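Researcher: Next entry: Mannose-6-phosphate/insulin-like growth factor II receptor (Tachyglossus aculeatus).
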Amino acid sequence: MVQDNCQVTNPATGYVFDLNSLKRESGYTISDIRKGSIRLGVCGEVKDCGPGIGACFEGTGIKAGKWNQKLSYVDQVLQLVYEDGDPCPANLHLKYKSVISFVCKSDAGPTSQPLLLSVDEHTCTLFFSWHTSLACEQEV
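Model: Predicted structure:
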């Protein structure tokens, strides 16, 4: 099976971040003003663009990252990075990578709000901020 535990326990507070409470039911698909939609399968890959692929971009089938359990807890910031996307013509070695930096925001709850920080056209690294309550150890 492909592991979808979507949870990591942090050593700081001893909290488990269960991202299963969100899940790709449909997949969050935000619109990029330049190109098109990007559909991300948090805690569950999108079969639509091929099972295993988590971040899929609306452009024929640009894969911006395979869903993999890179669930890392940085100090007050949940890190989920989609690696192994498609290779970019720029440097070739550089592939479409999606790094979602989850920063906490309590008024989010079931509806966490995304924010585009920067799209790097060289390194194909998509820097997204995700304002979610699940990003930090909420006391409730």
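Model: Note for the record: The chain is about 0% helix and 40% strand.
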